[PDB]
Amino acid sequence: NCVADYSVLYNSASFSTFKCYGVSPTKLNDLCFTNVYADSFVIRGDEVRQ
Amino acid sequence: QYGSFCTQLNRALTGIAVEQDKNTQEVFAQVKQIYKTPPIKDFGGFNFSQILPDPSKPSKRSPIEDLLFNKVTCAQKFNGLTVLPPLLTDEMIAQYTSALLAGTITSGWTFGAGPALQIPFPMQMA
Amino acid sequence: YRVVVLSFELLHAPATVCGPKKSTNLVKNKCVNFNFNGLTGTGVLTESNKKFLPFQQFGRDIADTTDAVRDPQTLEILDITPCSFGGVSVITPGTNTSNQVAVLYQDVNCTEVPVATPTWRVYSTGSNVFQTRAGCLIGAEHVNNSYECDIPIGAGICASYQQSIIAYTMSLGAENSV
Amino acid sequence: NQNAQALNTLVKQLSSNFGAISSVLNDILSRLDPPEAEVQIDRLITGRLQSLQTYVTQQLIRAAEIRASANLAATKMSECVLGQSKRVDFCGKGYHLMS
Amino acid sequence: NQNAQALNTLVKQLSSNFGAISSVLNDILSRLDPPEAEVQIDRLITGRLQSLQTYVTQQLIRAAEIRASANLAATKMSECVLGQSKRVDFCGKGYHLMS
Numbered sequence: 001n002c003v004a005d006y007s008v009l010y011n012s013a014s015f016s017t018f019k020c021y022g023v024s025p026t027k028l029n030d031l032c033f034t035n036v037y038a039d040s041f042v043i044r045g046d047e048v049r050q
Numbered sequence: 051q052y053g054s055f056c057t058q059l060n061r062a063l064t065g066i067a068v069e070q071d072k073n074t075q076e077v078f079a080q081v082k083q084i085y086k087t088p089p090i091k092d093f094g095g096f097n098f099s100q101i102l103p104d105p106s107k108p109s110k111r112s113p114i115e116d117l118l119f120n121k122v123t124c125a126q127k128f129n130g131l132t133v134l135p136p137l138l139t140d141e142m143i144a145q146y147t148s149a150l151l152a153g154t155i156t157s158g159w160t161f162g163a164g165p166a167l168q169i170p171f172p173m174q175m176a
Numbered sequence: 177y178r179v180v181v182l183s184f185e186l187l188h189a190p191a192t193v194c195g196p197k198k199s200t201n202l203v204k205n206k207c208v209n210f211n212f213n214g215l216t217g218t219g220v221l222t223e224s225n226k227k228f229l230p231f232q233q234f235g236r237d238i239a240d241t242t243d244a245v246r247d248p249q250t251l252e253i254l255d256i257t258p259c260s261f262g263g264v265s266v267i268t269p270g271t272n273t274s275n276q277v278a279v280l281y282q283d284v285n286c287t288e289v290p291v292a293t294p295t296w297r298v299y300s301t302g303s304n305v306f307q308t309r310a311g312c313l314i315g316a317e318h319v320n321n322s323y324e325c326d327i328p329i330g331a332g333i334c335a336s337y338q339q340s341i342i343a344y345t346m347s348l349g350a351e352n353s354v
Numbered sequence: 355n356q357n358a359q360a361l362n363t364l365v366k367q368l369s370s371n372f373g374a375i376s377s378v379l380n381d382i383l384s385r386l387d388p389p390e391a392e393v394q395i396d397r398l399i400t401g402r403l404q405s406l407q408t409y410v411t412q413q414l415i416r417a418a419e420i421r422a423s424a425n426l427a428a429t430k431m432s433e434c435v436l437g438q439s440k441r442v443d444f445c446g447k448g449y450h451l452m453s
Numbered sequence: 454n455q456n457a458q459a460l461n462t463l464v465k466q467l468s469s470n471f472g473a474i475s476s477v478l479n480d481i482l483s484r485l486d487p488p489e490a491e492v493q494i495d496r497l498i499t500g501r502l503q504s505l506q507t508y509v510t511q512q513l514i515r516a517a518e519i520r521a522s523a524n525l526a527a528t529k530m531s532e533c534v535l536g537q538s539k540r541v542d543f544c545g546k547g548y549h550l551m552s
């Protein structure tokens with residue numbers, strides 16, 4: 001029940017491959033999705049293939 | 051880029067539709083002229099008023115046809131399918147059937163093999 | 177390294193988590209596309225009432241084509257309906273006899289025909305529109321007198337060529353009483 | 355009944371995704387890259403076209419059957435109504451008089 | 454006309470690439486390596502096979518219809534030329550004499 005505002009994702013640099021879109025192609029910040037669950041965690045970062 | 055399958059499918063469905071139109075035309079349009087039963091109803095005792103169209107009802111059908119039509123009997127339209135109307139409506143088909151009935155009642159069997167010649171129904175049954 | 181993952185799970189398009197800066201007023205009845213709460217689609221809009229549950233959000237129907245939209249700001253209900261469509265047929269005599277023709281659209285009304293090179297604009301508005309239960313054919317005059325079936329049109333209509341194309345109800349042969 | 359059931363089967367095939375992600379035309383275009391969903395469109399159109407071909411073939415079979423039945427109806431009408439037939443059980447049960 | 458149209462449609466399907474890069478197998482061999490030409494050629498094979506299957510099914514339907522017509526023609530020959538038939542509208546309009 002908020003505004004998401006994914007335009008901030010394009011800011012800064014580095015990050016990694018999204019490797020997960022899985023819906024369809026056109027525009028980023030139009031659909032309302034269903035539920036945004038953030039589960040940020042910190043690993044060694046040696047390999048993110050998992 | 052997938053080919054021309056759609057043209058074949060459209061052609062096949064169109065061919066089926068025109069086939070059905072020509073098919074009902076072949077089945078019912080067996081006569082070149084429209085015959086009508088005479089106003090006075092006497093045939094030696096045979097009662098055809100049950101089988102002939104009645105002027106009282108707004109729909110020009112016979113009481114058998116009324117039961118035949120009532121006894122036998124939706125958002126799918128809006129995805130790319132249509133239903134074409136028949137070439138000749140139910141009124142025209144009923145008129146063809148009425149003409150054929152009047153022909154076989156009055157003329158006998160000769161209205162399908164040349165000019166229609168009248169003959170009393172008891173003599174036709176003889 | 178710092179990593180954050182997102183669940184997503186896209187199954188319900190009209191939800192509450194979306195913040196596009198674009199805002200537009202609501203349309204009552206216009207054959208235009210709609211993008212309410214992330215749900216896209218096309219059709220015409222029509223207002224009606226329904227015993228919708230309050231806690232629920234929207235209503236989807238056969239082929240997952242939703243038939244309801246709710247305004248996040250104001251609480252009201254409207255229903256949708258897809259636009260009128262159909263093929264267009266061309267009724268022509270022999271190409272050598274004449275070049276003028278009379279198109280026949282499918283089960284559509286004469287009102288929206290103009291909405292949906294210079295000579296093509298003539299058939300849009302229409303000057304001799306004929307409305308028939310088989311379709312809205314234009315360019316052919318309707319004559320009360322009946323003739324033989326020359327060109328097949330649905331629901332007992334037939335078009336012939338007498339220097340203008342005419343459309344009439346087919347006759348079932350000359351009548352006679354024995 | 356068979357015509358209505360076949361038509362209903364034809365329109366229910368739009369709900370199946372044939373192995374794609376989604377199965378609706380609006381969900382064909384959201385945010386990723388066309389090719390990513392172009393293959394998806396390839397998969398969708400392959401199944402939809404196969405279902406359409408199946409419907410057309412079954413309709414052709416049924417049309418042939420009904421054409422045969424109606425040719426029988428036409429010849430029966432013309433030989434029993436427009437004349438008296440000597441065929442045994444072609445215009446009823448018994449000795450036929452009129453139809 | 455129907456036979457010629459079906460034959461013309463069948464041959465014309467070879468131009469369509471069915472989602473490949475080219476409809477000519479010589480170019481497919483010349484550009485694509487066999488490991489990848491193996492997966493590229495698959496589309497051409499399945500598309501042409503589908504076209505041929507559709508053509509064969511349509512030809513089967515047409516052959517059944519023409520067999521029905523030929524059986525009717527044989528019956529009419531045997532019953533109108535080799536003899537005189539009492540069937541009313543089976544030998545023209547009117548009482549039959551000979552054919």
Ligand SMILES: *[C@@H]1O[C@H](CO)[C@@H](O)[C@H](O)[C@H]1NC(C)=O
Nearest residue numbers: 268269270271272273274275
């Ligand atoms: C139409 O008329 C032209 C005259 O230029 C003639 O050559 C052609 O054979 C005609 N076609 C038909 C079907 O009568």
Ligand SMILES: *[C@@H]1O[C@H](CO)[C@@H](O)[C@H](O)[C@H]1NC(C)=O
Nearest residue numbers: 284285286287288307308309
């Ligand atoms: C077409 O629209 C006009 C405009 O209201 C209406 O009067 C007419 O009844 C419509 N046609 C049909 C077949 O309903």
Ligand SMILES: *[C@@H]1O[C@H](CO)[C@@H](O)[C@H](O)[C@H]1NC(C)=O
Nearest residue numbers: 317318319320321322344345
């Ligand atoms: C033909 O029918 C129309 C529609 O009923 C009527 O208005 C007209 O007076 C009739 N006669 C002529 C000559 O158009």
